[PDB]
């Protein structure tokens with residue numbers, strides 16, 4: 001709704017976990033990864 005102790009208002013692409021800010025979808029996801037640890041790695045591993 002509103003904020004004060006923050007600068008980045010709104011962005012075209014932000015994280016769903018915390019709410020980070022991004023400009024390109026690809027980027028948004030990249031970070032989103034961090035929000036994952038207890039998971040198996042098959043075709044790709046962090």
Ligand SMILES: [Zn+2]
Nearest residue numbers: 015017018019
């Ligand atoms: Zn996040």
